Amino acid sequence: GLLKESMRIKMDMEGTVNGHYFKCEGEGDGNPFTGTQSMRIHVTEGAPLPFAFDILAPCCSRTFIHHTAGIPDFFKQSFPEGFTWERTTTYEDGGILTAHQDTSLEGNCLIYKVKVLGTNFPADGPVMKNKSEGWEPCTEVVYPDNGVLCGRNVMALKVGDRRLICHLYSSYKSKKAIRALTMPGFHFTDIRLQMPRKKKDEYFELYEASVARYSDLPEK
Amino acid sequence: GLLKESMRIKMDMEGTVNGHYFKCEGEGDGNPFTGTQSMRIHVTEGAPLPFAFDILAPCCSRTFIHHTAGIPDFFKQSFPEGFTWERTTTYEDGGILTAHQDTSLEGNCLIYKVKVLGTNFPADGPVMKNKSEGWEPCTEVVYPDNGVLCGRNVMALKVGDRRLICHLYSSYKSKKAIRALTMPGFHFTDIRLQMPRKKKDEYFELYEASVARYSDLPEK
């Protein structure tokens, strides 16, 4: 009963991408049980961003996943203690984006602290030339490994009619004692991450919906 | 028109995995419109296989995909000329499996010719020790690129309670004229590949169901 149908989100992000330093602050809200959320991000240092904020959008919220079919919820179970995650995203045109994140809960507010390091994005690519148009929907593969939740994802950055593919390797670690938590089995998480509004490469708005589920295909 | 509700399948596979040569013959049948199929495979040379046949199972059929939501069917459009596919699968414990396949149609029978080269599989791993228990269901990301259909997939080989992740990079190329074909947009393909029976590392039976679809998540 620690989580409410309306939760606040506060986020602080610090990072360097291809040598450009930046800091971001985010305020957001969402319904963790229907799995929907939104966030407003202001780049407070390093604006205007000289690269596509799309690559930072997936670093900006796992408590807001609608879990179906009785799949245990690693993230909601982790409270009040909270959790962390770490991720590396490899872009097929060379870029690498790694991030570490800490998620805590105070009252009605989820608190996110994010560190980001991105390297080797091609200077002529859509990320550094800031020519991307958001992400396709995606489906993460999620599975346990000795109390750590592992994630594997294929995402597609929209560049006109073309798609730049990247590969996400994630680990989610609970701060709760492993014995007080029931790990899920192998499953999938549909995610649709959208950026409805952006301004001056400094203000961004994100919306996300997520659903944890099993395969829709029947087992013969 | 050219495809029937019941199609037969003949498959010839030749390959070398970690230096072990093998030859396989397969006979199968399925419904291409409901997207279901089964196949009996006999290793006619190199039996018993000293490695898990699971890694060869995805090389053994894209005509049998149920396409929903009006998604154009690249593979069914490609006939009578047929199509090819190329794939490399990288396993997270080092193994690499490359394959090339030719799909043609004669009367009511689909004819597959498969070439396989696998390298760098760890001698102590579940593949070479033949300790795997089939595949989890998966969801391929499928998208167009100048008349070629590109696929990216994350698959999970079951080894007891642990999962060995591999990454599939696929290209599907039609033998039909580029102008004579309607390319699909970005979409997903759910696949469940199962091995109901196996015998002496020499006889294998596969069942597969496939569905092409869009994300179930509404776009806000």
Tab-separated table of C-alpha atoms in Angstrom:
chain	number	residue	atom	x	y	z
A	1	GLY	CA	0.000	0.000	0.000
A	2	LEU	CA	3.044	2.246	-0.253
A	3	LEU	CA	2.223	3.199	-3.861
A	4	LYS	CA	-0.799	5.312	-4.798
A	5	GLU	CA	-2.776	5.490	-8.034
A	6	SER	CA	-1.161	8.900	-8.574
A	7	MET	CA	2.566	9.178	-7.877
A	8	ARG	CA	4.962	12.086	-8.273
A	9	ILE	CA	8.387	11.677	-9.880
A	10	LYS	CA	11.509	13.779	-9.306
A	11	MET	CA	14.606	13.090	-11.402
A	12	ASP	CA	18.168	14.398	-11.539
A	13	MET	CA	20.403	13.339	-14.432
A	14	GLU	CA	24.073	14.165	-14.998
A	15	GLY	CA	26.169	13.008	-17.883
A	16	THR	CA	28.598	13.409	-20.735
A	17	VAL	CA	27.812	12.453	-24.340
A	18	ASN	CA	30.647	12.605	-26.903
A	19	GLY	CA	32.433	14.975	-24.542
A	20	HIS	CA	29.473	17.335	-24.030
A	21	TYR	CA	28.521	17.680	-20.370
A	22	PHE	CA	24.933	18.211	-19.277
A	23	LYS	CA	22.560	18.167	-16.308
A	24	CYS	CA	18.798	17.599	-16.425
A	25	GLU	CA	15.956	17.921	-13.950
A	26	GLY	CA	12.644	16.148	-14.431
A	27	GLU	CA	9.254	16.372	-12.770
A	28	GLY	CA	6.641	13.797	-13.643
A	29	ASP	CA	3.611	11.866	-12.509
A	30	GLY	CA	1.880	8.628	-13.263
A	31	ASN	CA	-0.312	5.692	-12.378
A	32	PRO	CA	1.952	2.736	-11.497
A	33	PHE	CA	-0.868	0.196	-11.658
A	34	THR	CA	-2.202	1.090	-15.091
A	35	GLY	CA	1.431	1.574	-16.077
A	36	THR	CA	1.256	5.075	-17.540
A	37	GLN	CA	3.411	8.088	-16.838
A	38	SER	CA	4.640	11.446	-18.090
A	39	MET	CA	7.640	13.636	-17.366
A	40	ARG	CA	8.847	17.176	-18.086
A	41	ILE	CA	12.640	17.520	-18.408
A	42	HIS	CA	14.649	20.759	-18.335
A	43	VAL	CA	18.320	20.712	-19.372
A	44	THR	CA	19.708	23.030	-16.699
A	45	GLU	CA	23.371	22.827	-17.784
A	46	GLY	CA	24.704	22.240	-21.278
A	47	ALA	CA	21.664	23.606	-23.148
A	48	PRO	CA	21.004	23.666	-25.998
A	49	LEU	CA	21.883	19.975	-26.257
A	50	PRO	CA	24.071	19.402	-29.351
A	51	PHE	CA	22.691	15.863	-29.806
A	52	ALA	CA	19.329	14.113	-30.014
A	53	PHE	CA	17.658	13.967	-26.597
A	54	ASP	CA	16.057	10.723	-27.804
A	55	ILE	CA	19.133	8.799	-26.623
A	56	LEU	CA	18.555	10.145	-23.099
A	57	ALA	CA	14.792	9.539	-23.030
A	58	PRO	CA	15.052	5.805	-22.081
A	59	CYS	CA	17.267	6.813	-19.130
A	60	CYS	CA	14.531	9.035	-17.680
A	61	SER	CA	10.967	4.584	-14.667
A	62	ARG	CA	10.163	0.942	-13.997
A	63	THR	CA	7.643	1.310	-11.151
A	64	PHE	CA	5.027	2.207	-13.796
A	65	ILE	CA	4.498	-1.174	-15.456
A	66	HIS	CA	1.069	-2.785	-15.671
A	67	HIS	CA	1.681	-6.425	-14.722
A	68	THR	CA	-0.761	-8.908	-16.245
A	69	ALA	CA	-1.401	-12.628	-15.723
A	70	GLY	CA	-0.173	-12.478	-12.131
A	71	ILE	CA	3.468	-11.878	-13.092
A	72	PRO	CA	5.335	-10.801	-9.916
A	73	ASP	CA	6.367	-7.134	-9.950
A	74	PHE	CA	10.079	-6.909	-9.105
A	75	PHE	CA	9.968	-3.119	-8.947
A	76	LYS	CA	6.820	-2.562	-6.874
A	77	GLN	CA	7.923	-5.366	-4.547
A	78	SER	CA	11.267	-3.621	-4.029
A	79	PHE	CA	9.681	-0.789	-2.026
A	80	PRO	CA	10.087	0.797	0.520
A	81	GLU	CA	13.761	-0.051	-0.033
A	82	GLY	CA	13.770	0.833	-3.738
A	83	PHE	CA	16.041	-0.426	-6.475
A	84	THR	CA	18.781	0.454	-8.954
A	85	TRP	CA	19.355	-0.281	-12.599
A	86	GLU	CA	22.308	-0.226	-14.952
A	87	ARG	CA	22.239	-0.326	-18.709
A	88	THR	CA	24.410	-0.273	-21.793
A	89	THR	CA	22.875	0.570	-25.180
A	90	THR	CA	24.920	-0.166	-28.297
A	91	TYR	CA	23.873	1.617	-31.479
A	92	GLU	CA	24.521	-0.228	-34.720
A	93	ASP	CA	26.262	2.848	-36.160
A	94	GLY	CA	28.855	2.897	-33.343
A	95	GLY	CA	27.428	4.943	-30.486
A	96	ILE	CA	27.495	3.583	-26.937
A	97	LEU	CA	25.298	4.941	-24.139
A	98	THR	CA	25.742	3.573	-20.614
A	99	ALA	CA	23.810	4.665	-17.556
A	100	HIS	CA	23.384	3.899	-13.873
A	101	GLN	CA	20.255	4.842	-11.946
A	102	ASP	CA	19.062	4.827	-8.343
A	103	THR	CA	15.325	4.743	-7.527
A	104	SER	CA	14.108	5.590	-4.023
A	105	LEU	CA	10.684	6.430	-2.591
A	106	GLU	CA	9.897	9.265	-0.205
A	107	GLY	CA	6.248	9.786	0.669
A	108	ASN	CA	4.322	10.229	-2.567
A	109	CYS	CA	7.416	10.901	-4.671
A	110	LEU	CA	9.698	8.525	-6.540
A	111	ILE	CA	13.242	9.933	-6.627
A	112	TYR	CA	15.535	9.094	-9.568
A	113	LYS	CA	19.279	9.781	-9.747
A	114	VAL	CA	20.815	9.058	-13.168
A	115	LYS	CA	24.419	9.121	-14.407
A	116	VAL	CA	25.040	8.877	-18.161
A	117	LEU	CA	28.153	8.362	-20.305
A	118	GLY	CA	27.878	8.233	-24.093
A	119	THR	CA	30.821	7.774	-26.446
A	120	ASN	CA	31.760	7.167	-30.071
A	121	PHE	CA	28.578	8.461	-31.653
A	122	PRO	CA	29.514	9.286	-35.273
A	123	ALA	CA	29.778	13.040	-35.813
A	124	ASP	CA	27.784	12.685	-39.064
A	125	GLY	CA	25.080	10.452	-37.559
A	126	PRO	CA	21.460	11.281	-36.728
A	127	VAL	CA	22.178	11.428	-32.991
A	128	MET	CA	24.949	14.034	-33.125
A	129	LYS	CA	23.288	15.871	-36.020
A	130	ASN	CA	20.048	15.877	-33.964
A	131	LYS	CA	17.906	14.453	-36.777
A	132	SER	CA	15.885	11.756	-34.994
A	133	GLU	CA	12.122	11.570	-34.525
A	134	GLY	CA	11.681	9.413	-31.437
A	135	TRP	CA	11.443	5.684	-30.836
A	136	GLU	CA	9.324	2.893	-32.195
A	137	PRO	CA	7.423	0.858	-29.609
A	138	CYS	CA	9.494	-1.994	-28.248
A	139	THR	CA	9.277	-5.293	-26.365
A	140	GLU	CA	11.855	-6.034	-23.665
A	141	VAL	CA	12.782	-9.603	-22.728
A	142	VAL	CA	12.920	-9.889	-18.923
A	143	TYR	CA	14.248	-12.827	-16.901
A	144	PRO	CA	15.767	-13.622	-13.471
A	145	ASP	CA	19.385	-14.420	-12.614
A	146	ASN	CA	20.046	-15.128	-8.914
A	147	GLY	CA	17.818	-12.343	-7.670
A	148	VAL	CA	18.842	-9.814	-10.341
A	149	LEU	CA	16.301	-8.942	-13.034
A	150	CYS	CA	17.894	-8.983	-16.497
A	151	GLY	CA	16.581	-7.157	-19.537
A	152	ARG	CA	17.390	-7.384	-23.229
A	153	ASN	CA	15.806	-4.998	-25.701
A	154	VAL	CA	15.958	-4.039	-29.372
A	155	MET	CA	14.948	-0.443	-30.026
A	156	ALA	CA	14.606	1.497	-33.262
A	157	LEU	CA	15.316	5.225	-33.527
A	158	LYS	CA	13.258	6.858	-36.264
A	159	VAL	CA	15.242	8.875	-38.820
A	160	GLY	CA	12.765	9.719	-41.549
A	161	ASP	CA	11.821	6.455	-43.230
A	162	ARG	CA	14.950	4.732	-41.890
A	163	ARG	CA	15.497	3.035	-38.536
A	164	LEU	CA	18.698	3.096	-36.473
A	165	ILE	CA	18.719	-0.082	-34.384
A	166	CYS	CA	20.214	-0.265	-30.912
A	167	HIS	CA	20.552	-3.053	-28.357
A	168	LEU	CA	19.898	-2.576	-24.639
A	169	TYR	CA	21.508	-4.699	-21.890
A	170	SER	CA	19.915	-3.972	-18.500
A	171	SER	CA	20.255	-5.171	-14.910
A	172	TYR	CA	17.702	-4.241	-12.231
A	173	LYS	CA	18.805	-4.814	-8.635
A	174	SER	CA	16.516	-4.648	-5.621
A	175	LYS	CA	17.545	-3.054	-2.342
A	176	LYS	CA	15.100	-5.412	-0.612
A	177	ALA	CA	16.359	-8.636	0.912
A	178	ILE	CA	16.067	-11.364	-1.720
A	179	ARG	CA	14.043	-13.561	0.635
A	180	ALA	CA	11.329	-10.898	1.034
A	181	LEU	CA	10.721	-10.856	-2.739
A	182	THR	CA	9.266	-13.235	-5.348
A	183	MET	CA	11.187	-13.130	-8.624
A	184	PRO	CA	9.148	-13.305	-11.849
A	185	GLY	CA	9.791	-15.882	-14.531
A	186	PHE	CA	10.801	-15.220	-18.116
A	187	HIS	CA	8.396	-12.712	-19.678
A	188	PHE	CA	8.063	-9.686	-21.956
A	189	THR	CA	7.445	-5.996	-21.345
A	190	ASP	CA	5.770	-3.940	-24.051
A	191	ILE	CA	6.887	-0.306	-23.843
A	192	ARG	CA	5.772	2.705	-25.876
A	193	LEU	CA	7.942	5.757	-25.181
A	194	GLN	CA	6.817	9.008	-26.808
A	195	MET	CA	8.084	12.593	-26.784
A	196	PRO	CA	4.974	14.723	-27.430
A	197	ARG	CA	6.717	18.100	-27.058
A	198	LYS	CA	10.206	19.592	-27.174
A	199	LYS	CA	11.595	23.119	-27.237
A	200	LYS	CA	14.968	24.688	-27.993
A	201	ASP	CA	16.880	21.425	-27.264
A	202	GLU	CA	16.334	22.304	-23.599
A	203	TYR	CA	12.726	21.422	-22.616
A	204	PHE	CA	11.317	17.959	-23.297
A	205	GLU	CA	8.125	16.114	-22.448
A	206	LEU	CA	7.879	12.325	-22.368
A	207	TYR	CA	4.969	9.920	-22.050
A	208	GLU	CA	5.353	6.190	-21.510
A	209	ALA	CA	3.115	3.141	-21.239
A	210	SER	CA	4.367	-0.309	-20.209
A	211	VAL	CA	2.747	-3.745	-19.860
A	212	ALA	CA	4.364	-6.942	-18.572
A	213	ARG	CA	2.929	-10.058	-20.196
A	214	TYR	CA	3.607	-13.522	-21.576
A	215	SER	CA	3.695	-14.473	-25.241
A	216	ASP	CA	0.357	-14.207	-27.013
A	217	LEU	CA	1.168	-17.406	-28.916
A	218	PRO	CA	-0.427	-20.567	-27.506
A	219	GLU	CA	1.877	-23.372	-26.452
A	220	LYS	CA	1.173	-26.553	-28.425
B	1	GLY	CA	-3.196	-18.263	-55.294
B	2	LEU	CA	0.067	-20.196	-55.433
B	3	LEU	CA	-0.115	-21.209	-51.762
B	4	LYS	CA	-2.546	-23.785	-50.360
B	5	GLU	CA	-3.933	-24.200	-46.844
B	6	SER	CA	-1.786	-27.319	-46.563
B	7	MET	CA	1.785	-27.061	-47.830
B	8	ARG	CA	4.531	-29.642	-47.750
B	9	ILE	CA	8.146	-28.720	-47.046
B	10	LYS	CA	11.414	-30.338	-48.122
B	11	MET	CA	14.628	-29.068	-46.511
B	12	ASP	CA	18.296	-29.861	-47.110
B	13	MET	CA	20.799	-28.470	-44.603
B	14	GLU	CA	24.588	-28.743	-44.692
B	15	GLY	CA	26.981	-27.233	-42.226
B	16	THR	CA	29.920	-27.263	-39.850
B	17	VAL	CA	29.663	-26.298	-36.163
B	18	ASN	CA	32.896	-26.005	-34.138
B	19	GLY	CA	34.528	-28.144	-36.805
B	20	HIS	CA	31.870	-30.897	-36.725
B	21	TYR	CA	30.392	-31.497	-40.185
B	22	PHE	CA	26.752	-32.489	-40.554
B	23	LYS	CA	23.986	-32.933	-43.112
B	24	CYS	CA	20.241	-32.816	-42.360
B	25	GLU	CA	17.108	-33.668	-44.319
B	26	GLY	CA	13.693	-32.416	-43.277
B	27	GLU	CA	10.131	-33.107	-44.336
B	28	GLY	CA	7.358	-30.971	-42.957
B	29	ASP	CA	3.929	-29.506	-43.484
B	30	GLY	CA	1.947	-26.522	-42.380
B	31	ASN	CA	-0.704	-23.904	-42.936
B	32	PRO	CA	0.895	-20.663	-44.195
B	33	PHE	CA	-2.171	-18.523	-43.524
B	34	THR	CA	-2.803	-19.564	-39.933
B	35	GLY	CA	0.989	-19.581	-39.611
B	36	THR	CA	1.606	-23.036	-38.150
B	37	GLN	CA	4.016	-25.752	-39.197
B	38	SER	CA	5.821	-28.923	-38.176
B	39	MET	CA	8.910	-30.705	-39.446
B	40	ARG	CA	10.719	-34.022	-39.027
B	41	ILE	CA	14.504	-33.722	-39.361
B	42	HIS	CA	16.953	-36.597	-39.790
B	43	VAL	CA	20.678	-35.942	-39.435
B	44	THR	CA	21.785	-38.052	-42.407
B	45	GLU	CA	25.515	-37.392	-41.910
B	46	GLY	CA	27.433	-36.542	-38.758
B	47	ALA	CA	25.035	-38.297	-36.359
B	48	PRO	CA	24.933	-38.333	-33.426
B	49	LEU	CA	25.361	-34.564	-33.226
B	50	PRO	CA	27.946	-33.651	-30.556
B	51	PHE	CA	26.114	-30.361	-29.894
B	52	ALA	CA	22.583	-29.201	-29.122
B	53	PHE	CA	20.338	-29.316	-32.190
B	54	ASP	CA	18.545	-26.304	-30.669
B	55	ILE	CA	21.051	-23.957	-32.342
B	56	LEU	CA	20.110	-25.427	-35.747
B	57	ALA	CA	16.359	-25.384	-35.111
B	58	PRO	CA	15.883	-21.690	-36.123
B	59	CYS	CA	17.637	-22.443	-39.433
B	60	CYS	CA	15.020	-25.056	-40.373
B	61	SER	CA	10.476	-21.082	-42.658
B	62	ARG	CA	8.982	-17.615	-43.104
B	63	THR	CA	6.185	-18.494	-45.540
B	64	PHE	CA	4.168	-19.734	-42.532
B	65	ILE	CA	3.478	-16.439	-40.755
B	66	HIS	CA	-0.055	-15.286	-39.941
B	67	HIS	CA	-0.131	-11.606	-40.919
B	68	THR	CA	-2.611	-9.448	-39.005
B	69	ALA	CA	-3.741	-5.818	-39.258
B	70	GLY	CA	-3.293	-5.681	-43.029
B	71	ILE	CA	0.507	-5.951	-42.796
B	72	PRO	CA	1.890	-6.759	-46.273
B	73	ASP	CA	3.388	-10.254	-46.469
B	74	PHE	CA	6.907	-9.947	-47.916
B	75	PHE	CA	7.394	-13.708	-48.081
B	76	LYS	CA	4.068	-14.699	-49.644
B	77	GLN	CA	4.428	-11.821	-52.122
B	78	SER	CA	7.846	-13.149	-53.165
B	79	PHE	CA	6.389	-16.216	-54.928
B	80	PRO	CA	6.598	-17.922	-57.438
B	81	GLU	CA	10.168	-16.605	-57.582
B	82	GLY	CA	10.830	-17.307	-53.908
B	83	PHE	CA	13.253	-15.630	-51.566
B	84	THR	CA	16.441	-16.014	-49.547
B	85	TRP	CA	17.485	-15.146	-46.041
B	86	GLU	CA	20.850	-14.546	-44.386
B	87	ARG	CA	21.361	-14.570	-40.650
B	88	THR	CA	24.044	-14.295	-38.010
B	89	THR	CA	23.268	-15.238	-34.411
B	90	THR	CA	25.706	-14.163	-31.712
B	91	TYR	CA	25.522	-16.018	-28.400
B	92	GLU	CA	26.386	-14.096	-25.251
B	93	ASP	CA	28.842	-16.830	-24.198
B	94	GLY	CA	30.853	-16.450	-27.433
B	95	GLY	CA	29.342	-18.788	-30.019
B	96	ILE	CA	28.521	-17.484	-33.506
B	97	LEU	CA	26.125	-19.209	-35.922
B	98	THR	CA	25.915	-17.912	-39.500
B	99	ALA	CA	23.447	-19.297	-42.035
B	100	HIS	CA	22.221	-18.708	-45.576
B	101	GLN	CA	18.972	-20.149	-46.906
B	102	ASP	CA	17.183	-20.373	-50.242
B	103	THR	CA	13.395	-20.830	-50.397
B	104	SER	CA	11.760	-21.904	-53.662
B	105	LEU	CA	8.336	-23.311	-54.571
B	106	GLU	CA	7.568	-26.336	-56.768
B	107	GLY	CA	3.874	-27.138	-57.073
B	108	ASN	CA	2.569	-27.448	-53.522
B	109	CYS	CA	5.985	-28.047	-51.915
B	110	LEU	CA	8.330	-25.438	-50.443
B	111	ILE	CA	12.017	-26.281	-50.938
B	112	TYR	CA	14.652	-25.051	-48.464
B	113	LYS	CA	18.423	-25.164	-48.966
B	114	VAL	CA	20.368	-24.177	-45.834
B	115	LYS	CA	24.099	-23.609	-45.277
B	116	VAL	CA	25.379	-23.320	-41.697
B	117	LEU	CA	28.749	-22.341	-40.195
B	118	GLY	CA	29.135	-22.131	-36.415
B	119	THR	CA	32.329	-21.070	-34.655
B	120	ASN	CA	33.703	-20.188	-31.215
B	121	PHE	CA	31.149	-22.096	-29.149
B	122	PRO	CA	32.704	-22.678	-25.704
B	123	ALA	CA	33.685	-26.319	-25.260
B	124	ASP	CA	32.257	-26.212	-21.716
B	125	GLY	CA	29.049	-24.421	-22.721
B	126	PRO	CA	25.550	-25.865	-22.868
B	127	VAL	CA	25.562	-26.008	-26.674
B	128	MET	CA	28.680	-28.151	-27.082
B	129	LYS	CA	27.855	-30.148	-23.950
B	130	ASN	CA	24.328	-30.655	-25.369
B	131	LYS	CA	22.582	-29.504	-22.174
B	132	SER	CA	19.897	-27.148	-23.538
B	133	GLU	CA	16.132	-27.568	-23.284
B	134	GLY	CA	14.756	-25.599	-26.220
B	135	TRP	CA	13.856	-21.972	-26.795
B	136	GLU	CA	11.623	-19.460	-25.088
B	137	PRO	CA	9.061	-17.724	-27.293
B	138	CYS	CA	10.411	-14.602	-28.946
B	139	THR	CA	9.391	-11.417	-30.767
B	140	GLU	CA	11.367	-10.324	-33.826
B	141	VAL	CA	11.560	-6.666	-34.847
B	142	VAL	CA	11.000	-6.438	-38.621
B	143	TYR	CA	11.478	-3.352	-40.777
B	144	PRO	CA	12.171	-2.341	-44.402
B	145	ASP	CA	15.464	-1.123	-45.860
B	146	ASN	CA	15.491	-0.373	-49.612
B	147	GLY	CA	13.561	-3.491	-50.587
B	148	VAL	CA	15.291	-5.783	-48.064
B	149	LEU	CA	13.392	-6.954	-44.990
B	150	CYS	CA	15.556	-6.599	-41.882
B	151	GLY	CA	15.040	-8.566	-38.696
B	152	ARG	CA	16.458	-8.234	-35.202
B	153	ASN	CA	15.632	-10.807	-32.556
B	154	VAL	CA	16.549	-11.663	-28.969
B	155	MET	CA	16.244	-15.362	-28.207
B	156	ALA	CA	16.806	-17.249	-24.963
B	157	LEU	CA	18.084	-20.826	-24.881
B	158	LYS	CA	16.870	-22.673	-21.787
B	159	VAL	CA	19.565	-24.321	-19.643
B	160	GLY	CA	17.825	-25.449	-16.480
B	161	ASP	CA	16.565	-22.318	-14.759
B	162	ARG	CA	19.105	-20.094	-16.547
B	163	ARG	CA	18.791	-18.446	-19.954
B	164	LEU	CA	21.573	-18.104	-22.530
B	165	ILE	CA	20.761	-15.032	-24.615
B	166	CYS	CA	21.552	-14.746	-28.299
B	167	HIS	CA	21.038	-11.978	-30.831
B	168	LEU	CA	19.791	-12.599	-34.362
B	169	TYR	CA	20.573	-10.294	-37.287
B	170	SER	CA	18.529	-11.308	-40.340
B	171	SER	CA	18.138	-10.091	-43.905
B	172	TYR	CA	15.271	-11.360	-46.080
B	173	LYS	CA	15.688	-10.770	-49.813
B	174	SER	CA	12.999	-11.363	-52.421
B	175	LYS	CA	13.776	-12.831	-55.827
B	176	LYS	CA	10.865	-10.751	-57.138
B	177	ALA	CA	11.345	-7.359	-58.777
B	178	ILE	CA	11.615	-4.473	-56.314
B	179	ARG	CA	8.738	-2.632	-58.043
B	180	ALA	CA	6.489	-5.722	-58.035
B	181	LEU	CA	6.366	-5.959	-54.217
B	182	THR	CA	4.663	-3.962	-51.450
B	183	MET	CA	7.068	-3.507	-48.554
B	184	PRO	CA	5.652	-3.655	-45.017
B	185	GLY	CA	6.361	-1.040	-42.404
B	186	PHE	CA	8.024	-1.499	-39.042
B	187	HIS	CA	6.284	-4.290	-37.126
B	188	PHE	CA	6.802	-7.345	-34.890
B	189	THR	CA	6.669	-11.101	-35.436
B	190	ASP	CA	5.807	-13.323	-32.477
B	191	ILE	CA	7.383	-16.766	-32.859
B	192	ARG	CA	7.108	-19.868	-30.694
B	193	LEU	CA	9.512	-22.622	-31.798
B	194	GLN	CA	9.180	-25.957	-29.985
B	195	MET	CA	10.850	-29.378	-30.225
B	196	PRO	CA	8.219	-31.955	-29.172
B	197	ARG	CA	10.459	-34.986	-29.825
B	198	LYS	CA	14.101	-35.945	-30.260
B	199	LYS	CA	15.928	-39.263	-30.665
B	200	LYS	CA	19.617	-40.226	-30.319
B	201	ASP	CA	20.836	-36.755	-31.350
B	202	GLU	CA	19.785	-37.823	-34.848
B	203	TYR	CA	15.991	-37.446	-35.227
B	204	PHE	CA	14.235	-34.216	-34.267
B	205	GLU	CA	10.675	-32.933	-34.553
B	206	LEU	CA	9.839	-29.224	-34.574
B	207	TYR	CA	6.620	-27.234	-34.317
B	208	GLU	CA	6.373	-23.496	-34.899
B	209	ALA	CA	3.726	-20.781	-34.793
B	210	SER	CA	4.291	-17.227	-36.060
B	211	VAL	CA	2.182	-14.049	-36.096
B	212	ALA	CA	3.039	-10.665	-37.628
B	213	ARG	CA	1.475	-7.762	-35.747
B	214	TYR	CA	1.868	-4.237	-34.426
B	215	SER	CA	2.341	-3.272	-30.802
B	216	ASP	CA	-0.716	-3.887	-28.626
B	217	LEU	CA	0.009	-0.647	-26.771
B	218	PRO	CA	-2.174	2.275	-27.878
B	219	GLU	CA	-0.373	5.305	-29.248
B	220	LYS	CA	-1.255	8.326	-27.122
